[PDB]
From a paper:
Escherichia coli YtfE is a di-iron protein of the widespread Repair of Iron Centers proteins (RIC) family that has the capacity to donate iron, which is a crucial component of the biogenesis of the ubiquitous family of iron-sulfur proteins. Bacterial RICs are composed by an N-terminal ScdA-like domain and a C-terminal domain that folds as a four-helix bundle where a histidine/carboxylate di-iron type center is inserted. In E. coli YtfE, the best studied RIC protein, the center is coordinated by H84, H129, H160, H204, and two μ-carboxylate bridges formed by E133 and E208. We show that YtfE establishes protein-protein interactions with the scaffold IscU, where the transient cluster is formed, and the cysteine desulfurase IscS.
Crystals of E. coli YtfE could only be obtained when the proteins contained the mutation to alanine of the two vicinal cysteines C30 and C31 (designated YtfEM), a result that agrees with previous reports. The structure of E. coli YtfEM contains two channels. One channel is mainly hydrophobic (which will not be addressed in this study), and a second hydrophilic channel that connects the metal center to the solvent. The di-iron center is located ca. 10 Å below the channel entrance, which is approximately circular in shape with a diameter of ∼2.3 Å. The channel is formed mainly by hydrophilic residues, namely H160 and H129 (that are also Fe ligands), K132, E159, E125, and E162. The three negatively charged glutamates are located at the channel entrance and solvent exposed suggesting a possible iron exit. In YtfEM, hydrogen bonds occur between residues D5 and R17, E49, and R86. Analysis of the electrostatic potential on the molecular surface of E. coli YtfEM shows that domain A is mainly positively charged and domain B is mainly negatively charged. In addition, the cavity where the di-iron center is inserted is positively charged, and the negative charge at the surface in this region is mainly due to residues E125, E159, and E162. Besides these coordinating ligands, an oxo-bridge between the iron atoms is also present in YtfE.
Numbering used by the authors: 2 to 220
Write the structure that this text describes.
């Protein structure tokens, strides 16, 4: 039956199901409405195995269920858990990528263009998060969420733009897998990239699958 539920609900309801979908490159963040059945079919995956993996994870409940939490507490959580972290993590990654592309400019496995793409992500995320905090989030706190179809659609479009950059970043880095040649700086940067991708998809998932639809519905 898990195959008939949307990816978003499985990610928000089952602990560490988010990490499972990232293992299968399944987009529970922007494509959260997509059922697990239609997602496993797209990628030619054996859905029955995914269902058993979720069944094991589903033995335990999730630490915090945001699906029914107050919108104000979701917003405040997003700001300190995701927005503020992104502002610290991306400048750090940009400088690491700059150091790696130079130090290992001669290796074949070096991720050329990574610094360019991290910079693009940082600029778009920065402007994006400012708009949410200065325009959309206050609108929702004042109870005007039902009148926010316009702004939310613009934010969800930007969420898609950010998703495309993530895919470019994953390709440039062999799905964020360092080569055997990788030094310590090189390996720690990829660990930071994976941490960014994980947070950003949970960040977008929480907005697209909970905050936005519930605001539009008048909660
Ligand atoms: Fe956000
Ligand atoms: Fe956002
Ligand atoms: O965001």
């Amino acid at each position: 039956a898990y195959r008939d539920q949307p990816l978003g609900e499985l990610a928000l309801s089952i602990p560490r199901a988010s990490a499972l979908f990232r293992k299968y490159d399944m987009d529970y963040a922007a494509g959260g409405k997509q059922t697990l059945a239609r997602a496993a079919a797209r990628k030619e995956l054996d859905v029955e195995v995914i269902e058993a993996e979720l069944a094991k994870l589903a033995e335990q409940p999730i630490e915090k269920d945001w699906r029914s939490a107050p919108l104000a507490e979701i917003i405040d959580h997003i700001i300190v858990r995701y927005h503020d972290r992104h502002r610290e993590q991306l400048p750090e990654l940009i400088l690491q990528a700059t150091k790696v592309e130079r130090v290992h400019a001669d290796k074949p496995s070096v991720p050329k263009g990574l610094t360019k793409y991290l910079t693009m992500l940082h600029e778009e995320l920065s402007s994006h998060m400012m708009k949410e905090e200065q325009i959309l989030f206050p609108m929702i706190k004042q109870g005007m969420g039902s009148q926010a179809m316009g702004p939310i659609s613009v934010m969800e479009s930007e969420h898609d733009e950010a998703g495309e950059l993530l895919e470019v970043i994953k390709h440039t880095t062999n799905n964020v897998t360092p080569p055997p040649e990788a030094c310590t700086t090189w390996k720690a940067m990829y660990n930071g990239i994976n941490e960014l991708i994980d947070d950003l998809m949970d960040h977008i998932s929480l907005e697209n699958n909970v905050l936005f639809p519930r605001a539009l519905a008048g909660e």
